[PDB]
């Protein structure tokens, strides 16, 4: 199986599950990437509101393609070649555009082979000059590679026996009919060739001059009439059709009009009859249900995703056009025009000016607007995936709290089903659990009491409450004063709900009830956030069942998997993973697949081979020989692959690569090896003894590279071994607290929103509850028991809101039904 081959070979693992096989470069191609990649990424402005680096991209592609360094090993241990400009995410951006560059050459290499076999056919017998070879070589975008390919298929596409040297299934355009009738000459005896019109357009003046033919178009039309084309007006139509199509598939014409649509293109929207009714203020289509002359550069982050989302269901019909609603046809009709006022020139200019417009209306306006739509949509799909990555960045950029024993309070709506809680070890395993099943209000005092009795036995360092309803806001005080008799934290449960329904946890926790299995993970999340996410979101359906954006179902799924899996591989390598922990604890087995070099295959293989030895990792050298794993992958994995030193080189528990162990000893020798094992370990005794600059020119001489800020790492690594740079665990501000419990967000706390409501009890004005559970105060200024009753539901618009008081003020007044 290939699962053996991935395990066998010495490449980084994700290099092998990349769809294109990774191959080295020859420093000219590797330059042809970094100037293309810096052009097609990092520099071209988006059409939506969202220099020296070429050396860094050149360097980064050297590590990836040639020396086979994955993005974690480059963004931390080779920072001199990439920093300042290339962040760790830009190294992930470059590796994605190497994928796109390779497909461009792979298709161009297959397209140069196709043109030369046509010249092998043509010279064996229009003109395939080297210009047709030149633009094929000069292709920079995959869009340009389609103009060339369509241009080639227009003329020489009707040449099948190039493969003879299962027939063709002939075309459907009318061009093949007319060129079978030999109207090429009458198309040719138009006053220009399509290519020279293209030179007019990119230069915006009549550089090439129209070659007027001294005849009448109609009296020249008599020569070409046939059985296929009677009526010499029909050979005017049959000729202007070729002129439009030859203008259309001419790349110089198609490129210049494309760059007009980049800048001057307008988005006009109208709704269907089905969209004149379903569109309301709550619908996402309110902000654009009617639009006129909106330039596409005026589009905002995901506005165009929603517009094409509404068009997909059937609500909206839109068009993208260049002219306003001085047209661009008027701009360019002069470029194909003789100003001579002779009569025969006038009909020839008449035929020329109505062939050029058919190219616009029939051919170019259709194809350029669709292409621009796909490019705008791909921008808007990318914004969401960036937004779905910033959110996973934030959930993982939180430090573990200050072995920590944590008890986790998880509750559902508390009626016919009780509140649970589960304690966890200092290393993540379960210890003990409890039930808290909240007149019978006096029986709640019994449940309050037993909380102290249990926390006196085992001592949490913090209790965590799963914000699941608005009911959590007071439960906080309940356990808070149980403690007043150690902290309390409001921790959300969005992955805990997934942890419940995960079949993986049911293998872990079979007898444990649902809200108890949820109660495990919050004490696991605060224990460390990264370890839980790798466990629970270890499958494609799992990680996508979280909510990062409303629109995340409408972006390319496998792209969204990659931009989320890169954030894991970013954080896991930055944090590092302790191996011999994970052989014992299966809860940390899912971390190692996100180390560079490892993955789903070598990760399972490494832990299994250790189970063949049933031994402990003491050194990184144990991995290379006694775990017999290749030095190429070892140069990726070992720089991030923690070993607990209190279990023997102590540098195996540091962010120091095995190959740079020796330069780390010279950081400790000049603090005056074996004696220096503990010298800076026990104090950073003085930070100014190490002449970091003077080492660098010594590192210029021996060590053979600018290791300037590599030293700055090893200096700071000896100070604190694996200092976690994750932000220390703060407590939620009331904004998060308001948003966790109400399960909805400041784009749904719209002030002006006609909402459902429920009046539950009056204790001054009328007080109502939402289905979210917040308190809605109907103002006395808008107020009488007879006018508004008790117990019912009434349409209500908000005039004032907050986040700290859960006030969601209503109106009930029909004079608020506008504005």
């Amino acid at each position: 199986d290939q699962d053996n081959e991935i395990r066998a070979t010495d490449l980084p693992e994700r290099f092998q599950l990349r769809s294109i096989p990774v191959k080295g470069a020859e420093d000219d191609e590797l330059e042809e990437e970094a100037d293309w990649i810096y052009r097609n990424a990092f520099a071209t402005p988006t059409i939506s509101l969202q220099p020296s680096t070429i050396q860094k991209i050149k360097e980064a592609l050297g590590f990836m393609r040639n020396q086979h360094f994955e993005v974690p090993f480059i963004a931390f241990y080779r920072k001199e070649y990439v920093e300042p400009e290339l962040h760790i995410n830009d190294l992930w951006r470059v590796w994605q555009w190497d994928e796109k560059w390779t497909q461009l050459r792979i298709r161009k290499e297959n397209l140069t082979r196709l043109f030369e076999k046509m010249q092998a056919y043509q010279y064996e017998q229009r003109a395939l000059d080297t210009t047709d070879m030149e633009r094929l070589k000069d292709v920079q975008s995959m869009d340009e590679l389609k103009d060339v390919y369509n241009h080639f298929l227009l003329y020489y596409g009707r040449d099948i026996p190039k493969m003879q040297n299962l027939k063709q299934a002939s075309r459907r355009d009318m061009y093949t009919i007319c060129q079978s009738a030999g109207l090429d000459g009458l198309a040719k005896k138009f006053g220009l060739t399509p290519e020279q019109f293209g030179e007019n357009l990119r230069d915006s003046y009549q550089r090439h001059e129209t070659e007027q033919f001294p005849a009448e178009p109609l009296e020249l039309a008599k020569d070409y009439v046939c059985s296929q084309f009677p009526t010499p007006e029909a050979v005017l139509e049959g000729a202007r059709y070729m002129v439009a199509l030859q203008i259309a598939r001419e790349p110089l014409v198609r490129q210049v009009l494309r760059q007009t649509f980049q800048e001057r293109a307008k988005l006009n929207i109208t709704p269907t009859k089905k969209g004149r009714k379903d569109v309301d203020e709550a619908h996402y289509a309110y902000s654009f249900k009617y639009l006129k002359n909106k330039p596409v550069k005026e589009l905002r982050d995901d506005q165009f995703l929603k517009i094409c989302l509404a068009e997909d269901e059937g609500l909206l019909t839109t068009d993208i056009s260049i002219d306003l609603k001085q047209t661009y046809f008027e701009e360019i009709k002069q470029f194909y025009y003789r100003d001579e006022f002779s009569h025969q020139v006038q009909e020839w200019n008449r035929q020329r000016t109505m062939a050029i417009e058919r190219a616009l209306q029939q051919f170019l306006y259709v194809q350029m607007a669709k292409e621009l739509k796909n490019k705008l949509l791909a921008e808007a799909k990318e914004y969401v995936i960036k937004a779905c990555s910033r959110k996973l960045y934030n959930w993982l950029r939180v430090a573990p709290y200050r072995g920590i024993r944590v008890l986790g309070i998880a509750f559902s709506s508390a009626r016919d089903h009780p509140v649970f809680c589960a304690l966890v070890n200092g290393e993540g395993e379960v210890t003990d659990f409890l039930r808290l099943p909240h007149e019978e209000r006096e029986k709640k005092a019994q449940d309050i009491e037993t909380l102290k009795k249990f926390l006196l036995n085992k001592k949490p360092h913090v209790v965590t409450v799963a914000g699941e309803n608005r009911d959590a806001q007071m439960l906080i005080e309940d356990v808070k004063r149980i403690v007043h008799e150690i902290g309390v934290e409001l921790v959300d449960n969005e992955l805990a709900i997934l942890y419940m329904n995960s079949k993986k946890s049911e293998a872990e926790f079979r007898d444990y009830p649902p809200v108890l299995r949820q109660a495990v993970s919050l004490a696991r999340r605060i224990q460390d956030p990264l370890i839980e996410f790798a466990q629970v979101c270890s499958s494609d359906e799992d990680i996508l069942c979280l909510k990062f954006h409303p629109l995340q179902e409408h972006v390319v799924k496998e792209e969204l998997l990659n931009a989320l899996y890169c954030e894991f591989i970013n954080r896991v390598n930055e944090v590092g993973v302790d191996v011999n922990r994970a052989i014992a604890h299966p809860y940390s087995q899912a971390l190692i697949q996100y180390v560079c070099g490892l993955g789903p295959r070598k990760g399972t293989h490494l832990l299994k081979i250790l189970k063949q030895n049933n031994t402990r990792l003491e050194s990184r050298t144990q991995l290379v020989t006694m775990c017999h794993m290749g030095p190429k992958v070892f140069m990726n994995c070992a720089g991030f692959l923690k070993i607990d030193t209190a279990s023997i080189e102590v540098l195996d528990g540091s962010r120091v690569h095995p190959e740079t162990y020796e330069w780390a000893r010279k950081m400790a020798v000049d603090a005056l090896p074996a004696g220096a094992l503990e010298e800076i370990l026990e104090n950073p005794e003085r930070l100014k003894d190490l002449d970091l600059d003077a080492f660098a020119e010594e590192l210029e001489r021996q060590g053979y590279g600018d290791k300037h800020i590599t030293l700055y790492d090893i200096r700071a690594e000896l100070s604190c071994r694996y200092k976690d740079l994750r932000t220390a665990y703060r407590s939620p501000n009331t904004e998060e607290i308001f948003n966790m419990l109400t399960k909805e967000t400041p784009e749904t706390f719209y002030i002006g929103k006609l909402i459902i409501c429920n009046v539950t009890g009056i204790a001054i004005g009328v007080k109502t509850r939402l289905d979210n559970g917040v308190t809605g105060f109907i103002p006395t200024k808008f107020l009488p028991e007879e006018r508004v009753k008790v117990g019912m539901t009434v349409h209500c618009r908000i005039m004032k809101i907050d986040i700290e008081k859960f006030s969601a003020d209503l109106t009930c007044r029909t004079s608020d039904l506008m504005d």
Binding site: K167, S170, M174, T176, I177, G314
Partner: protein
Amino acid sequence: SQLIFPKEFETAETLLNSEVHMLLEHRKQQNESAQELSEVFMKTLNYTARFSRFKNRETIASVRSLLLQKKLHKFELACLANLCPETAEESKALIPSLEGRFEDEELQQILDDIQTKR
């Protein structure tokens, strides 16, 4: 195909993929002048707006008229006139049920006729 497989379609006149298009958009203009249509109707309207080689009531009517004069199978009357072959041999290769029936000169003539109506 060559034989009619079911038993009911024979007494049921076949429509060109352009005549379908014009009467489906007739249904469209009928609808918005006065409920909303199915996915099958709209998707078929798009499909038959792709492959609609004739655009005028006179043109489709003329194509109907010629193919009625030329005395051929009712299934093949539309399976060519909305497929529009160029060569007679491609008409024979696509249609296993028209070979051995017609002579090639008038075949190319009437193919030129239907292409002339476009």
